Subunit: 289 residues, 4 copies
């Protein structure tokens, strides 16, 4: 039975790296001027290099079976100090985007990924105001049972989207409504979008983060999608002041080096200092408790 | 009562040189994007649409108006030149997935007899086309629309617009335009309003080949719309589409999008928009003269 | 020589400029033309612009460097359109193509007059810390070159920041140039539009009336610095203030540079804009009594 | 009046130096990043002193200007004791619509006074143009070297290439080489140079261009970051040092990205400091190889 201590820093803070992005990462390579079509091997090589170079600074790394889990294990890319999280979400494209719908990946063999050293699984939950709450709660319950019956931690990631029908979309209220619905759903860790995209006055960001904290009844961390990499360190500090326990971040660490020459040099010189600073901020905030 | 015919919405040459100002929430988003004070009032859309009709209808064989923002106002203010026929939108746009037009149905609130009394000669229906949605539902909506028009002596204009599938990531926009024409190009409407292949970009010879391929699947007169075509490439698009068998255009953005949010709207419609619509009409006559 | 030789029947000026030299090569490069851009690309564009647009112009401004000889030999200039020949020698410097300008000592005024030219044009760069007397002496020499050969003189004062200092008020510089050169005995003053033709019509009219008060010869506006969509309003406002029309290049043809099918684009995109500007000139001259 | 290069280097002998001396060019950066205009002098002063206070702990030296921050940084004890002070001795003259069209020696700099305050070096920008007189540049560098050396200060020269006053022949890469052929043996203590090729392209071409430049410089040399993307500056330092450079003296690649962000002190600590720390680690790694 793994527990939360297995994916945290010695301080108890979460300083976790995400490299599990799938077709969304292929689109990032194309947008940064990579030769199209972008081969699967370009994603695999980047993900394994990111794990190899950045996992020494992370309490856990989130890997996907589609492009990098098997390769990261076989190549010993993950530092012994860094726990493995395996994505258990099956992304369904639609309406011109890579992740229009998400279901539990029926191909994940929890016992097999546990034998390979995984300590946790992760599930994206898309949240829309006009889709049924009970279907989301049932998917989270099935996911929690898959994790807990195999001694793995469950990490859920509710992400808000506009309604299927209608034009009433308040992103800030949707994040609160998702937390009211799923913040006490029996997962081990809640991974949430940062209120206000981490923008604006620190005082308003803290108020919005404290409002969110009040609806989450498990440890929670922020993800970086939608937050400028320069504002993500402040977002971690403010979220943790509000009651968060750290971060699970991808884009705010490595997005800026996609398409630059000398990938391994760029991950070490550009990405690693950003991940190191985020880990130091987590320890500073945990020390204040 | 009046039975309108294609001649009632064409130039003397028989070419179509038609203006669209029926955009609804999509036009509000254009005003916001161009720096208009938010929230953008309905009156800003109405005033722009009526000014566009007043200033540009003298250069158009028909103008497409929406009941939501401008049909009643354009009629009451005599904004439409008598030489310009009125087309009324009969589509009900349903927003979803963060866009203003995610779904479309026939507007059950349109009273065809009432809009005919106000002088309308034609109705228009947007049809969203997706590879994984049922063709029979699209064909049934077009049949009900054709009956609404024809039973009231009005012309039927259909506008198939391709969208990515609801589920999956296989989207070939150029093939989708062809597949929509194979499905709806012989559906008994009076006029087919179609997206320009290749967004009107690239070598003239490739644009002509793509336009001739599309022509082969359309068994009614057809015109091109300008959405997705740079205003500077739209004149060439009209020329190439007409060389391939099209009979003209029904355009909005390529005529007036560039003046949204500029000062002195009436001056801008006259000095920037009108010369572009005038040139498109001259191109339509030049191409009709070659046939 | 008479001003009536370069005006519309109304007496308004509706004139086309295609005399841009290295500045036009930079426009081709910026629009994605294969570099280095050959001289023949400029010549072909200039001659096509003259051939297609001169039917809508009361005069066309040509340069000897790239197009005067070719336009004459190929009968590119409509009989209804007078020829203006540039008499300026552009000197590059400080990373720009036109850092300094002198009278072109190579222009044979008698030879261009025999070809049917009616006018010469001279750019005068105006800087607050350069000597007014040197500018006035160059304008006097230019006026004598024109008038002694029965040609009209068109001067184009263009304001630039000072050689030394950071005090640059573009609107005051335009006024100071007109106070200095607005009664210099040229036949026509070609001026930059106040405020780049931007803002409220009422402020544009006030700025145009202020400029009018300092110009004691007919004056026209040039389009450099004015968005092509605001140039029609700029002509209307300048003429309400006392201007007699325009001598424009960029606001007519800049948008077709680098598009496919150049001749089609000049006819379908550029010509309608030049036609509308001519109609505005006639509308404004008709209000004059 | 003994002076030593060791006073502005890391223990490794590498240079890991911070520049915050930008004047009207920094005001233009604040305006471009959406600061309320006109931008007050106090906005520049507060930013420069905060940058010194927060970043000087990671730098072997900091370059300060008298116009906006030298007096304030000294009075407020903003410079870490481990970080040497370099004082700008250039007087920037605007012209032709830019803030730095011409540069002369600042006749107002009191070398004895800044030395009493603990400064170890002065810095002089030299604008290099193919059609301006080489002898006038060499004479200004000689006067500057004498001002420094007679006061026990190090001399840092920064030749920056510009297009000619007259003509359109401007080869930026050849100009950098011609400036080094002219000034690379001019008796200054340190040569501060623009990175060849803006640090862009294949590492192999960047190294060749850096080795060509190294061959013309007969004093220690460092690269500046102006014109190099902040993400390519770490590779530029590594390649320049492989070619024979001894480190960097950088401003924009450290702090430009935080201008106009909220919570300036937090942003300098969380965004700027990690970049300066990594550059210092790269300098030590490269000095260890030699």
């Amino acid at each position: 039975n793994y527990t939360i201590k297995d994916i945290t820093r010695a301080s108890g803070g979460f300083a976790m790296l995400a490299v599990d992005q799938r077709e969304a990462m292929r689109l990032m390579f194309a947008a940064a001027g990579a030769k199209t079509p972008v081969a699967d091997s370009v994603l695999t090589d980047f993900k394994v290099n990111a794990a190899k170079i950045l996992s020494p600074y992370a309490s856990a790394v989130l890997l996907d079976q589609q492009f990098c889990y098997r390769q990261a294990v076989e190549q010993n890319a993950v530092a012994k100090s860094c726990a493995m999280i395996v994505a258990a979400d099956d992304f369904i494209p639609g309406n011109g985007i890579p992740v229009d719908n998400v279901v539990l990946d029926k191909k994940i063999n929890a016992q097999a990924v546990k034998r390979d050293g995984a300590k946790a699984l992760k599930l994206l939950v898309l949240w829309r105001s006009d889709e049924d709450a009970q279907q989301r709660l049932n998917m989270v319950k099935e996911f929690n049972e898959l994790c807990h019956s195999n001694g793995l931690l469950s990490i859920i990631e509710p992400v808000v989207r506009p309604p299927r029908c209608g034009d009433k979309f308040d992103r800030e209220q949707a994040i609160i409504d998702a937390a009211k619905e799923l913040g006490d759903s029996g997962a081990d860790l809640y991974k949430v979008e940062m209120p206000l995209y981490g923008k604006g006055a620190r005082s308003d960001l803290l108020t919005a983060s404290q409002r969110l904290n009040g609806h989450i009844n498990m440890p929670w961390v922020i993800l970086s999608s939608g937050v400028d990499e320069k504002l993500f360190p402040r977002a971690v500090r403010v979220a943790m002041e509000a009651g968060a326990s750290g971060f699970l971040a991808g884009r705010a660490v490595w997005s800026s080096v996609i398409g630059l020459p000398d990938t391994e040099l760029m991950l070490r010189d550009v990405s690693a200092p950003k991940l190191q600073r985020l880990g130091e901020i987590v320890d500073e905030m945990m020390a204040k408790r």
